[PDB]
Subunit: 237 residues, 4 copies
């Protein structure tokens, strides 16, 4: 199976698979059953921002999800990620809908990785920043239902021509280049990511959520990973 | 055919195809026959540095190639590159040997592209930096004879197990992700690249050289592009 | 006297001191009488963006000033700036009003300088980015009338409590740290700057303009530099 | 008194003021008596690298100090630094000698601060990088005995003309511009620093150490802060 580390913006509480009974953000290490979660009062119809960070010295993966003037939700988990993940990875965004639905719209996305040693210059770095998305994003690997729209937004899950969200959808976008996140000789490795998003929904209980994730380079949407599994996992183990 | 823009570090004068009669650096726009050149006193056995820059406002592609304490060679050419190149490209390094030979060793390579509009943050950016190369560089597309060695260096052309250079070799390394260098709505696009290199040779007249190049995303080594054509062009037109 | 290099966004044509007879952008090298200008259809009441760039290899100082959907104005000048300027400088924004007036409001400002040699890491770099300004910007040297307002904007010239611009005003903001733009041993030096601005005015012919400028570290507003001299020069020589 | 947060590379065990009985690295929050320490096998005569990082979400200040091929020493401490420090600070390096001595030579130093909100672009950033130091470093505030030498190195403490270290010395270097590390409206603030150093000594027990520190902007060497107090504190409380 794939090897997954993710930060989930989980709009829909699936208490039968261990979610808290409220919308939440979470840190997922090789399981949909988050190792740490925080209560997230998600604001449908408003643009949110997520900031995710990690470095191999502190060994604390953290995320903050904010809406301007309203809320800042934070979650952290202590984990040696370079122990969990392979040395080379791809990074990506995923989203799903299931029986219930929402737009999973990404307006911008940036990422930086550094692999350092014995200099003020990091032996290796990758950075990308998208403040919008082109009609043919040749530097993204689009998986499942993911597409870019005429506004320059990345629609992870299916929307109709009027922008209405559809159920039973799954989509992912990976950055095209593999990222070298560890080498046995590294002194420190770090990564940071930010994205902005817009979740709209006509449903009283929108679903299912958005993730930022890191995986083996050849990662693909698992069979049966729809809805509550966020396009990341084949099961709820 | 491919669409090529390159900066050539041309060690071997092929006067029959328009080279000056001395080792030189040059700006190549869709032809091996450089649009501008400068005399390059290349120092075999010494580590050199090349810095290349362009922005769409100034429209001047420039390169400087230096060896510490000895020489700084500069070449520039006025050209609207975003007119010449497609909107999406891959960036790369090439090298060849022919009847004569040299190591074409890359010790480090960095690149930054920016596509800007109406903000102090560039609507799009890609950056990578390699201060060494891994044994399996999953973020490089290696073409022809190019490989990485046990010292962490990128050997563009064939070297034996003792490091001796071989003739009749061609190799290229592309960064894995396509780069978005223009959009019709862009206010300014720019790129910068630096690499360090080591050319060693037992030959009295080493050959053939190293380039940094930008091309259509699906670029491949053309048939008949060995030696004097630097792995870039099918002919000397 | 100070040593000044500037990019001027000159809203008011002072034809008696060599301005073209229309609002214009210009490159100023030690004189208010621009070495190169371009016609600028300035859009009062709209947020503009200016992007300025230079590197010591190309030796071409360029600027582009844009308003989204309307206009992109470009000006360039070939000059060896590291010949004109001292090795250490301060960088800044200036603005004036005179008999006629306008707001000279800066919404954001970023700057990067690099001094490079023989590595993919630039022997020296300074970068700052302000996407807003604090009520006490301790990393700015405010000169003359310059202040920050309750919206987080930098008002270079005097505005009343309702935001109405005042005549006979001059103001500048320098970044606090000196910038090392040249060393005799440098292989390449470069700088880039971006700012966004908002010029509003009740006057039929607004004045006087905004500049980005580079100067000796101890630069100060010259006596008699108001209005048409943009807070930069003691006279119109 | 000043408000100090520091990472200490403490070469000399002062057990009478709470040091461990071995050379160590440590996290100092408003006291020389470190909140967390780690055993540091310091290699006199070898170039070391220190990497320091923090972000306001994780709230974990970490440092790693390494010598290539030999050792990597790590220390971390959970602390809300934006609670401890004022909103505006200066950042710096300090060093001392006392009865015993060592060179406190800085070969390079870089720093990045970010203050973020609701965008993939950080509402505020400052970065500097010095891969060497000029004879008149106009962007450093040199305090006490600190000077730059003819090799381009920053000698924090006094060395004779042959490079021999002197006792009873204290010196600091601050970056010239204040740094904005917090604002009440910030979603996340972070900083990172790296420096490389060379400690040489003829003494069997070299002293006293080097720090990277963050302080109120108007920070100065306290009276009585020599030797074991690392030029940071007026006493050992
Ligand atoms: O999109 C929201 C959720 O819809 C489905 O789960 C249900 C949510 N409410 C229900 C009510 C009845 C039944 Br049967 C089901 Cl499967 C569900 C499933 O698709 C879940 O995976 C998903 O998390
Ligand atoms: O590697 C150096 C050069 O070697 C070959 O050209 C010759 C250089 N000296 C010669 C001498 C004789 C003959 Br025949 C040839 Cl082809 C050459 C050809 O392979 C050239 O493309 C290449 O630039
Ligand atoms: O602010 C616009 C301009 O106003 C003044 O110049 C005049 C513009 N129109 C005029 C009409 C009459 C007289 Br007298 C003067 Cl000085 C001016 C002077 O302050 C100029 O320096 C400035 O560029
Ligand atoms: O430089 C090393 C140390 O030297 C001095 O402390 C002593 C170290 N060994 C000693 C032996 C005797 C006496 Br008295 C003293 Cl003060 C010391 C003092 O200067 C200390 O602050 C410093 O840490
Ligand atoms: Ca869920
Ligand atoms: Ca040739
Ligand atoms: Ca004018
Ligand atoms: Ca001590
Ligand atoms: Mn969940
Ligand atoms: Mn040639
Ligand atoms: Mn003018
Ligand atoms: Mn200690």
């Amino acid at each position: 199976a794939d090897t997954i580390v993710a930060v989930e913006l989980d709009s829909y509480p699936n208490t039968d698979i261990g979610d808290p009974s409220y919308p939440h953000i979470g840190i997922d290490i090789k399981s949909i059953r988050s190792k740490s979660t925080a209560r997230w009062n998600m604001q449908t119809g408003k643009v949110g921002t997520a900031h995710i960070s990690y470095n191999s010295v502190a060994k604390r993966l953290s995320a903050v999800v904010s809406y301007s003037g309203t809320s800042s939700t934070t979650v952290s988990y202590d984990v040696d990620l370079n122990n969990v993940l392979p040395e080379w990875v791809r990074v990506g965004l995923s989203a799903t809908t299931g029986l219930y639905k929402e737009t999973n719209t990404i307006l911008s996305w940036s990422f930086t990785s550094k692999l350092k040693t014995n200099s003020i210059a990091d032996a290796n770095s990758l950075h990308f920043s998208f403040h919008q998305f082109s009609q043919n994003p040749k530097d993204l690997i689009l998986q499942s239902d993911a597409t870019t729209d005429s506004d320059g937004n990345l629609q992870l899950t299916r929307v109709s021509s009027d922008g209405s969200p559809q159920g039973s959808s799954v989509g992912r976008a990976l950055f095209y280049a593999p990222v070298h996140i560890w080498e046995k000789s590294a002194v420190v490795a770090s990564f940071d990511a930010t994205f902005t998003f817009l979740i709209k929904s006509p449903d009283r209980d929108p679903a299912d959520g958005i993730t930022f994730f890191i995986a083996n380079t050849d990662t693909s949407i698992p069979s049966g990973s729809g809805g509550r599994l966020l396009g990341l996992f084949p099961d709820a183990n």
